[PDB]
C-alpha cells in the first residue's frame, strides 16, 4: 500500500491521473519524482521548468554542479539527484526531443531507467514540449516499465484522450 490517490489503473504496474506533477509531488513526497530533463540539465520550461521553479531554483543549482563535474547526460540516459522539497530523489531522465530531431527509438531506453526504482511519480517522457505523441509515449511506457509508475498528466483533455484510447 502506498499514498497515491485517485489514479486510474492501466495495467498491473502503470497508473495514471490528471494532475500537476508539482502539486502531486508536494502532497505525496514520493521516494522518486521523474524530471523530463535535457542532456544539459537546463530546467527552463515544461515539466523541468515547473519542477525547478517549485524548488526555488535549487534543482538548477545542484544540476549545474552535476554537469560541471560529469558533463552532459546521453539522450536516453538519466541521473539521480536530490528531490529537494518535492521528493526524496529526482530521477532526471532524457527522452528524445523531436523538436531537435532525436531518434524516437531512444524513448524505450529512456523508460528503462524507471526500472531501477520500485515506485515513481513521473510525466510521460518526450511528451509536451519534447514533441512526441503522448499516446505513443504511454504505449512505450506500459511495454517497458515493470516497476510501479504513477503518471501525472497535466492537461485534462490529453488525460481523457490517453485513457479513452488505451489498449
Ligand atoms: O509541460 C508540462 N506538461 C506537459 C504538457 C503541457 C501541455 C500539453 C501537453 O500535452 C503536455 C505533456 C506534458 C505532461 O503533461 O507531462 C507541465 C507539467 C506540469 C506543470 N506545472 C506547472 C506547469 C507545468 C507544465
From Swiss-Prot:
Catalyzed reactions: Thiol-dependent hydrolysis of ester, thioester, amide, peptide and isopeptide bonds formed by the C-terminal Gly of ubiquitin (a 76-residue protein attached to proteins as an intracellular targeting signal)
Membrane topology, from the record: Multi-pass membrane protein
Regulation affecting activity: Inhibited in vitro by GRL-0617.
Taxonomy, superkingdom: Viruses
Domain called Macro: residue spans: 1-167
Record's signal peptide: none
Subcellular locations according to the entry: Host endoplasmic reticulum membrane
Subunit structure, as described in the record: May form homohexamers. Interacts with N protein.
Record's function text: Responsible for the cleavages located at the N-terminus of the replicase polyprotein. Participates together with nsp4 in the assembly of virally-induced cytoplasmic double-membrane vesicles necessary for viral replication. Antagonizes innate immune induction of type I interferon by blocking the phosphorylation, dimerization and subsequent nuclear translocation of host IRF3. Also prevents host NF-kappa-B signaling. In addition, PL-PRO possesses a deubiquitinating/deISGylating activity and processes both 'Lys-48'- and 'Lys-63'-linked polyubiquitin chains from cellular substrates.
Protein's name according to its UniProt entry: Papain-like protease nsp3
Record organism: Severe acute respiratory syndrome coronavirus 2 (2019-nCoV)
Amino acid at each position: 500500500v502506498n499514498s497515491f490517490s485517485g489514479y486510474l489503473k492501466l495495467t498491473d504496474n502503470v497508473y495514471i491521473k490528471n494532475a500537476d506533477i508539482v502539486e502531486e509531488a508536494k502532497k505525496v513526497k514520493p521516494t522518486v519524482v521523474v524530471n523530463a530533463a535535457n542532456v544539459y540539465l537546463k530546467h527552463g520550461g515544461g515539466v523541468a521548468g515547473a519542477l525547478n521553479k517549485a524548488t526555488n531554483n535549487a534543482m538548477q543549482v545542484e544540476s549545474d554542479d552535476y554537469i560541471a563535474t560529469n558533463g552532459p547526460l546521453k539522450v536516453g540516459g538519466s541521473c539521480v539527484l536530490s528531490g529537494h522539497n518535492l521528493a526524496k530523489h529526482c530521477l532526471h531522465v532524457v527522452g528524445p526531443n523531436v523538436n531537435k530531431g532525436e531518434d524516437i527509438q531512444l524513448l524505450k531506453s529512456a523508460y528503462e531507467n524507471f526500472n531501477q526504482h520500485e515506485v515513481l511519480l513521473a510525466p510521460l517522457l518526450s511528451a509536451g514540449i519534447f514533441g512526441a505523441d503522448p499516446i505513443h509515449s504511454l504505449r512505450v511506457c506500459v511495454d517497458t516499465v515493470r516497476t510501479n509508475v504513477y503518471l501525472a498528466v497535466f492537461d485534462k483533455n490529453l488525460y481523457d484522450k490517453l485513457v479513452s484510447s488505451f489498449l
